[PDB]
Amino acid sequence: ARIILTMGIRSKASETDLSEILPEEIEERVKTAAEVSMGTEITQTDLDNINALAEQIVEFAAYREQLSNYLSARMKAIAPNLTQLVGELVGARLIAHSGSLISLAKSPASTIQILGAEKALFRALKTKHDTPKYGLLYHASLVGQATGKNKGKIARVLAAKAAVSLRYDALAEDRDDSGDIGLESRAKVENRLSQLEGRDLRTT
Amino acid sequence: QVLIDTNFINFSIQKKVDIVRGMMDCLLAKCNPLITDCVMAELEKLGPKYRIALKLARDPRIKRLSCSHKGTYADDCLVHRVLQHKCYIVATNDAGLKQRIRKIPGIPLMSVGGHAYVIEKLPDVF
Amino acid sequence: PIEYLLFEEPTGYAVFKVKLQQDDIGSRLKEVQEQINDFGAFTKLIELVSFAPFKGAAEALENANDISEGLVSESLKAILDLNLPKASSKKKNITLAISDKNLGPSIKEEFPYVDCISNELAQDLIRGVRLHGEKLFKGLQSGDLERAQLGLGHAYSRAKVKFSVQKNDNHIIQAIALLDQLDKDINTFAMRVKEWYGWHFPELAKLVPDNYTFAKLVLFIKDKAXXXXXXXXXXXXXXXXXXXXXXXXXXSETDMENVCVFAQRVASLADYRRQLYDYLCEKMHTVAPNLSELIGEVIGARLISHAGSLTNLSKQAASTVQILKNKGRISRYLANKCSMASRIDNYSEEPSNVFGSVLKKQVEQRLEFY
Amino acid sequence: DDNMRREVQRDLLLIKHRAALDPKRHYKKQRWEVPERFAIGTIIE
Amino acid sequence: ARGGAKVVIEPHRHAGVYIARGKEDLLVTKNMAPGESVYGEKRISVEEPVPPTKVEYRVWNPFRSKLAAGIMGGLDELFIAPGKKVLYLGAASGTSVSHVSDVVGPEGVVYAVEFSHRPGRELISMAKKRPNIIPIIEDARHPQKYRMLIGMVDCVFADVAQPDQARIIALNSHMFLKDQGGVVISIKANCIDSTVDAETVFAREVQKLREERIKPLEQLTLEPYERDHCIVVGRYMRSGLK
Amino acid sequence: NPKAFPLADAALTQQILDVVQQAANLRQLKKGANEATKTLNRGISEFIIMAADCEPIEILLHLPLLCEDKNVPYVFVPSRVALGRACGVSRPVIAASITTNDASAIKTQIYAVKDKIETLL
Amino acid sequence: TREEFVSFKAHYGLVTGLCVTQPRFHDKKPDLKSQNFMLSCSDDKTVKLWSINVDDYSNKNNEEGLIRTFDGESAFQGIDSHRENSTFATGGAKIHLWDVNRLKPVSDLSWGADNITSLKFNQNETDILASTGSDNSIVLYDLRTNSPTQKIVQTMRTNAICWNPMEAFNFVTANEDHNAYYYDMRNLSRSLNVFKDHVSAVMDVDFSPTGDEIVTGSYDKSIRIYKTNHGHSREIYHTKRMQHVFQVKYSMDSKYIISGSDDGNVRLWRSKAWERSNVKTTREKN
RNA sequence: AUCUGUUUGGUGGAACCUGAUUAGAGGAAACUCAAAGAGUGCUAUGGUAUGGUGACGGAGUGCGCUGGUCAAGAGUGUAAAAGCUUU
RNA sequence: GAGUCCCAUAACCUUUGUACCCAGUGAGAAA
RNA sequence: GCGAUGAUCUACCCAUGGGUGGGUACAAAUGGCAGUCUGACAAGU
Ligand SMILES: [Zn+2]
Structure with a gap:
């Protein structure tokens, strides 16, 4: 959409710079496709409401960056000891699945792993099978930093320490509000992670 | 559209009938007789003492149609033009070719006997 | 004696030199015909001499529409000034090998000493040039044929079909698919707006039912409160400022400015909708005006979307096309005429508005009959 | 894959023996071994 | 045969063609441009794994397309393929050429050729969702006019009903067709000769093809679908026709 | 260039409309553009x-x-009115069709007209 | 293409010889490029010009056949044209030279009052004509003296001759004893070679435009090729489907041998059995 | 159910038979090693290779080639002229 | 030790709120 | 002052008004199915 406000017609295409939008290889590439392309010409009445979708696309994405900014304010409002650990988006969704913050901290640690993956869980218990091991916690920034089966072993240590961080956030009437427990929680997982990546199954 | 052997030409000469004018007597309708390219390659290969048949074979009312073969042998050029279409009407007097076509369904075979020609598997004889 | 040849491309022309002529009695053979798939053998025939590329894609269309006439363009005239050595007009001409019999006289009209040959001899060489393709050109062709065929294929087609983009009807399709999602969302975010704005003023949404104006007063009055100018923009103005005094819901500040930008998003988006609506009301007035006279721009544009084009209203039987005692009578009696209006929109070049009004008054008197 | 097998395995076993599903159909005589690659899907209208 | 029932897709013996083995069977080729059926035929969807992407499959109506019955009657080698270029003749609309585009895939191209403007106008608007179809609106009897626009195609397809059908393929097989790449004629008995019989025209148009150095491999009749046609898969030898 | 192409000859107008009249009585004629x-959708038109x-x-x-x-195949005839009396209909039919029916006494006569239509194309 | 341009029911009798030359009319010029021209020589006292529509050059876009007929007194035996200025003599009971523009012949030539059966002009020193005889003879003619020039009498009659194009003063002849002979025009006391290879009468010889080879066809059902040097056939051509070859002509690019037959087909061959129509790469060529 | 017992799927697989195979059959790995096909890609270019052994090349010069235009002459042609062919 | 996304960022069923309903045929209706 | 440029045709009771029967679609539900994994060893020398 940002191209349409810059590119316009195919002869406006070759002349106008795309340094700001997709540069240095694709700018040459859209210049190449500009001269030979199977599409038609478009009138200046038809370049009015593609010329006003290019506004309304951009104003959505410019609103969404204000919108994820709004949760990052609300993470550090409600549970900042949580969102120093797992990030704004997971903690937006772990609260969203349970409901209130108080309802989430009353759950134990091991049910904060599998808070998302409830469809594959109760299938795997009602028929005798294997429980899913990540859950909604899998899209944390830290499970992705691990590899292999170590995505499982960090998914315990997070859901333990996130359960430690949540109860300091739901159930402390005084909050230091700096993520002071949470950054002590994340440094324990990074010690757990870099221990667990140093160990390897191979033979030396 | 009637295919023609070497043998049907040879016994046409001994029995004193025209091809085109004499076929219409047996057949009672109009016909376009057409010698293939393999069959003309036999009539030349028969040699000097069959050359009066080779004159009568090249007649502009006798049509010619080519074929895509690697061979002269027209006894098996002919059946292969018959299975794949079944519009033709074979004119032979070879004994082995008659047995090769009487097993094929629905192909009017035509031979020469006595005075005029005879047809076999036409349902519309008269 | 086929000395030079000429192969045409979307990337300009080419003038080749025949180094060796293939032997011409023996041209149906397996040997000389299987040489021309083999680039080692075909090179001994052909050397490139010239390659003048087209100056632009628009000049290509003018030149590609000139070969199919049979005539000689500017550049095709201009290339042959270089490459062909000037020979006599009567004795010992110069031979050029042309792909077309029809192009033949138009060269000799311009260049009287050039004899144009299109035998099955000469056309065998030109067909050889297509097969080995870009390897003959030794990289002088900047870009490729494979992109150049595609655009020049569509542009040659669009010229001879001759449809303007203003005649196109996918603009009716995409706009209907866009107006319905605007209507899907404008109430949706405004219902979100009230469920944000219920924490501050539950009374104003009762006064203001329109989603377009309810998102403006949130932009206008962020807090309580009299002496409000745009609240008169008058009966609801005093009914709101007094209701602003009688407030029940609670009161933060950045959180409401979230709702301010969120209620900003509604009023800008419905402004786009009223902008998009007039475009569709105009393109209906452009593309299918005889259909626009009967039912109007909106319901006319709905039918083209459910047909998937404007063509599939013309192809369908009038009983089959469907719009919604009057059901049994008028919904059939209009759908006959609704079919007929959509025929004469499709197959005219510039459709007339006048016959739709003529077709409209026929439908009126059956409504008078009811 | 070896997941989602049961609603697939019942389906393919109901196609290898599809001659019995209705006594008026009588399909051609074929064997229909289970192919290596397939993609069960529905019909959009 | 409803919108509810779920169908197994399975790859056909020919590449690029797919069989929909349901309670009844269907012939199906993968839609290159999803979400739209070009003439209203009922289309199948699946999903393939990020959430799984949507791949849509379009049914291949036999009674609409003369090519379509020959698959479903059974041809040994159909020279159309998911990589090959293919030349098409007489594509009035996207009744069949949109199908032939989907079976050659996003790599290979298809050259739609038809003379008339109003069906050709529809062929334009379909060709701007399928990038393979580049449509040519010149007459098929004069191939020197569109010689700039097509280069070295791998199999022509012939859906012309003009009675000079052998000469209109020879001028497109000699000048555009890559050697040793097949030719799929579709002969209609009534439109060539209405005086002589159905079977004579089949024995006449094969022998006209063998004059133009096309050895025809096989011949199908496609009788239960369409009345009295043939499609004759050729091969353009040009060199060693024997 | 004209939009009503191909338009039929005067001698072919007679031979078409006379075949229309017998197909009207044999019920193979379907009357009206709709x-x-x-x-054409059922595929049964001649x-x-x-x-x-x-x-x-x-x-x-x-x-x-x-x-x-x-x-x-298709033709143009010059008069909707003269197609009316060929149709047996009190009002001018502006578009007619001949259906494929194999028990047709006019089957040898339709194909004489149909062959003189493809001549125009 | 190996097809006909046009077929002409020319004569009610036999044709006896064809020759080809584009005329040079005093009134106009018939086109070299758009048409080609055949001339025939009949039994029934008849010589007929023929136009041909030719599809070679695409420079253009009437007169498809039979421009004008030349009637005579005696039955015509053979023809050849003279490449300078629209000139051809006929073979008959009297060879008599023709102008294309004139219906009656210009000059009657005869060494003696005997029938004459075939002719050919030479390629260079163009005015020299060679004339056979059924009275087992050969009489050479010279046009610029308007006169016959000398005579040689062989043991059996000569069916056809041919001048070499390259040396232009030696002519090979085809003789009815199963042998062919090769002369010098200067000294008809000694033949330059004989070619003893056949078993029956040779009906036609043709000198290669290379000037090395001579190709001959006999009343035996076979065709020999020999060089000028070796005196014997290096190569014999035969198939079952040809009988009694009456006419044989070497190609003009000197590679493919045409061969007329009594069986009615025109069979064309190669000169060397190995030379191909392929154009060969630098590795294969060496 | 200490009711019976067929059907379907899974395991197992004897006797006879019929087919094929054999220094018993089979699996796993790869920047290994070695035979041998089939297809594709690559400018894959001396039709007789360079302008030149001071016996050389450059420059001018003369001849020769090539083109169209002008002019005479020849030929056809007509009563003549027009037109007309022209190594 | 331990199957997420194939969507519990859902699907289905039920209950209420809202809106609505019981393609073809082809030559007669009006007196 | 008609029509192929289309005439015609496709649950209940209550005296031109309504209720009851079902179906389609939308939206809502802190309605339902629907219950939130294991618990002490592991890794290094
Ligand atoms: Zn054969």
Whole structure:
């Protein structure tokens, strides 16, 4: 959409710079496709409401960056000891699945792993099978930093320490509000992670 | 559209009938007789003492149609033009070719006997 | 004696030199015909001499529409000034090998000493040039044929079909698919707006039912409160400022400015909708005006979307096309005429508005009959 | 894959023996071994 | 045969063609441009794994397309393929050429050729969702006019009903067709000769093809679908026709 | 260049409309553009008679787009009124169609007209 | 293409010889490029010009056949044209030279009052004509003296001759004893070679435009090729489907041998059995 | 159910038979090693290779080639002229 | 030790609120 | 002052008004199915 406000017609295409939008290889590439392309010409009445979708696309994405900014304010409002650990988006969704913050901290640690993956869980218990091991916690920034089966072993240590961080956030009437427990929680997982990546199954 | 052997030409000469004018007597309708390219390659290969048949074979009312073969042998050029279409009407007097076509369904075979020609598997004889 | 040849491309022309002529009695053979798939053998025939590329894609269309006439363009005239050595007009001409019999006289009209040959001899060489393709050109062709065929294929087609983009009807399709999602969302975010704005003023949404104006007063009055100018923009103005005094819901500040930008998003988006609506009301007035006279721009544009084009209203039987005692009578009696209006929109070049009004008054008197 | 097998395995076993599903159909005589690659899907209208 | 029932897709013996083995069977080729059926035929969807992407499959109506019955009657080698270029003749609309585009895939191209403007106008608007179809609106009897626009195609397809059908393929097989790449004629008995019989025209148009150095491999009749046609898969030898 | 192409000759107008009249009595004639549209979808039409003098010429002009898609021949006749009396209908029929029916006494006569239509194409 | 341009029911009798030359009319010029011209020589006292529509050059876009007929007194035996200025003599009971523009012949030539059966002009020193005889003879003619020039009498009659194009003063002849002979025009006391290879009468010889080879066809059902040097056939051509070859002509690019037959087909061959129509790469060529 | 016992799927697989195979059959790995096909890609270019052994090349010069235009002459042609062919 | 996304960022069923309903045929209706 | 440029045709009771029967679609539900994994060893020398 940002191209349409810059590119316009195919002869406006070759002349106008795309340094700001997709540069240095694709700018040459859209210049190449500009001269030979199977599409038609478009009138200046038809370049009015593609010329006003290019506004309304951009104003959505410019609103969404204000919108994820709004949760990052609300993470550090409600549970900042949580969102120093797992990030704004997971903690937006772990609260969203349970409901209130108080309802989430009353759950134990091991049910904060599998808070998302409830469809594959109760299938795997009602028929005798294997429980899913990540859950909604899998899209944390830290499970992705691990590899292999170590995505499982960090998914315990997070859901333990996130359960430690949540109860300091739901159930402390005084909050230091700096993520002071949470950054002590994340440094324990990074010690757990870099221990667990140093160990390897191979033979030396 | 009637295919023609070497043998049907040879016994046409001994029995004193025209091809085109004499076929219409047996057949009672109009016909376009057409010698293939393999069959003309036999009539030349028969040699000097069959050359009066080779004159009568090249007649502009006798049509010619080519074929895509690697061979002269027209006894098996002919059946292969018959299975794949079944519009033709074979004119032979070879004994082995008659047995090769009487097993094929629905192909009017035509031979020469006595005075005029005879047809076999036409349902519309008269 | 086929000395030079000429192969045409979307990337300009080419003038080749025949180094060796293939032997011409023996041209149906397996040997000389299987040489021309083999680039080692075909090179001994052909050397490139010239390659003048087209100056632009628009000049290509003018030149590609000139070969199919049979005539000689500017550049095709201009290339042959270089490459062909000037020979006599009567004795010992110069031979050029042309792909077309029809192009033949138009060269000799311009260049009287050039004899144009299109035998099955000469056309065998030109067909050889297509097969080995870009390897003959030794990289002088900047870009490729494979992109150049595609655009020049569509542009040659669009010229001879001759449809303007203003005649196109996918603009009716995409706009209907866009107006319905605007209507899907404008109430949706405004219902979100009230469920944000219920924490501050539950009374104003009762006064203001329109989603377009309810998102403006949130932009206008962020807090309580009299002496409000745009609240008169008058009966609801005093009914709101007094209701602003009688407030029940609670009161933060950045959180409401979230709702301010969120209620900003509604009023800008419905402004786009009223902008998009007039475009569709105009393109209906452009593309299918005889259909626009009967039912109007909106319901006319709905039918083209459910047909998937404007063509599939013309192809369908009038009983089959469907719009919604009057059901049994008028919904059939209009759908006959609704079919007929959509025929004469499709197959005219510039459709007339006048016959739709003529077709409209026929439908009126059956409504008078009811 | 070896997941989602049961609603697939019942389906393919109901196609290898599809001659019995209705006594008026009588399909051609074929064997229909289970192919290596397939993609069960529905019909959009 | 409803919108509810779920169908197994399975790859056909020919590449690029797919069989929909349901309670009844269907012939199906993968839609290159999803979400739209070009003439209203009922289309199948699946999903393939990020959430799984949507791949849509379009049914291949036999009674609409003369090519379509020959698959479903059974041809040994159909020279159309998911990589090959293919030349098409007489594509009035996207009744069949949109199908032939989907079976050659996003790599290979298809050259739609038809003379008339109003069906050709529809062929334009379909060709701007399928990038393979580049449509040519010149007459098929004069191939020197569109010689700039097509280069070295791998199999022509012939859906012309003009009675000079052998000469209109020879001028497109000699000048555009890559050697040793097949030719799929579709002969209609009534439109060539209405005086002589159905079977004579089949024995006449094969022998006209063998004059133009096309050895025809096989011949199908496609009788239960369409009345009295043939499609004759050729091969353009040009060199060693024997 | 004209939009009502191909328009038939005066001698061919007679031979078409006379075949229309017997097909009217044998019930193979289907009468009306909205009814002739359907037989193109069912695939059972033999050929299409169209009236050139109906106003407009474009209300029925969808049929050659629909016929040449399916290789069904078609003509133009000059009068919708004279197609009316050939049709046996009190009102001028501006578009007619001949259905394929194999028990046709006029089967040898239809194919004489149909062969003289493909001559125009 | 190996097809006909046009077929002409020319004569009610036999044709006896064809020759080809584009005329040079005093009134106009018939086109070299758009048409080609055949001339025939009949039994029934008849010589007929023929136009041909030719599809070679695409420079253009009437007169498809039979421009004008030349009637005579005696039955015509053979023809050849003279490449300078629209000139051809006929073979008959009297060889008599023709102008294309004149219906009656210009000059009657005869060494003696005997029938004459075949002719050919030479390629260079163009005015020299060679004339056979059924009275087992050969009489050479010279046009610029308007006179016959000398005579040689062989043991059996000569069916056809041919001048070499390259040396232009030696002519090979085809003799009815199963042998062919090769002369010098200067000294007809000694033949330059004989070619003893056949078993029956040779009906036609043709000198290669290379000037090395001579190709001959006999009343035996076979065709020999020999060089000028070796005096014997290096190569014999035969198939079952040809009988009694009456006419044989070497190609003009000197590679493919044409061969007329009594069986009615025109069979064409190669000169060397190995030379191909392929154009060969630098590795294969060496 | 200490009711019976067929059907379907899974395991197992004897006797006879019929087919094929054999220094018993089979699996796993790869920047290994070695035979041998089939297809594709690559400018894959001396039709007789360079302008030149001071016996050389450059420059001018003369001849020769090539083109169209002008002019005479020849030929056809007509009563003549027009037109007309022209190594 | 331990199957997420194939969507519990859902699907289905039920209950209420809202809106609505019981393609073809082809030559007669009006007196 | 008609029509192929289309005439015609496709649950209940209550005296031109309504209720009851079902179906389609939308939206809502802190309605339902629907219950929130294991618990002490592991890794290094
Ligand atoms: Zn054969």
